[PDB]
Amino acid sequence: MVPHTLSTLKTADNRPASVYLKKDKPTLIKFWASWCPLCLSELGQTEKWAQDAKFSSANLITVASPGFLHEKKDGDFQKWYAGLNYPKLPVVTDNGGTIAQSLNISVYPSWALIGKDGDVQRIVKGSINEAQALALIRDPNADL
């Protein structure tokens, strides 16, 4: 109903990741890493999806884990990600992978849909495509 913790999270733009979410629409959390080809090369893709008019029905944002798994350390990842030409890319920082570990995300990329109520909806261990996302949201039982 009101995940205070989810809002406590911060983005790479030193802003509240909560503002990127909506308690009236389902959000989509995608975990990635600078050491991921299928992710780094998919940066732009996600940057557009979160802006896709069709995605307006379901919020879409990513999440990074600085100092976890094999990601850069805090401070650096930000200065490095700020040069990817993606100033409009929603990325929630996780000092130590708090969210990832909480959702059991060891494989990247990854996804996680959260109903408007703020409850879990689905969790995928990979990187879906355009149309894939459309159908994934259009139906509650569309892929897991």
Swiss-Prot record:
Domain notes: Possesses 2 methionine sulfoxide reductase domains (A/MsrA and B/MsrB) and 1 N-terminal thioredoxin domain.
Record has Ligase as a keyword: no
Annotated Thioredoxin domain residues: 2-142
Domain of life: Bacteria
Full-protein residues shown: 34 to 176 of 522
GO terms classed as biological process: cellular response to oxidative stress; protein modification process
Record protein name field: Peptide methionine sulfoxide reductase MsrA/MsrB
Disulphide bridges, residue numbers: 36-39
A GO term for molecular function: L-methionine-(S)-S-oxide reductase activity
Other facts noted in the record for this chain: The domain MsrB is stereospecific for the R isomer of the sulfoxide of MetSO whereas the domain MsrA is stereospecific for the S isomer.
Record-level GO cellular component terms: cytoplasm
Function: Has an important function as a repair enzyme for proteins that have been inactivated by oxidation. Catalyzes the reversible oxidation-reduction of methionine sulfoxide in proteins to methionine.
Similarity comment: In the N-terminal section; belongs to the thioredoxin family. In the central section; belongs to the MsrA Met sulfoxide reductase family.
UniProt KW keywords: Disulfide bond, Electron transport, Multifunctional enzyme, Oxidoreductase, Redox-active center, Transport
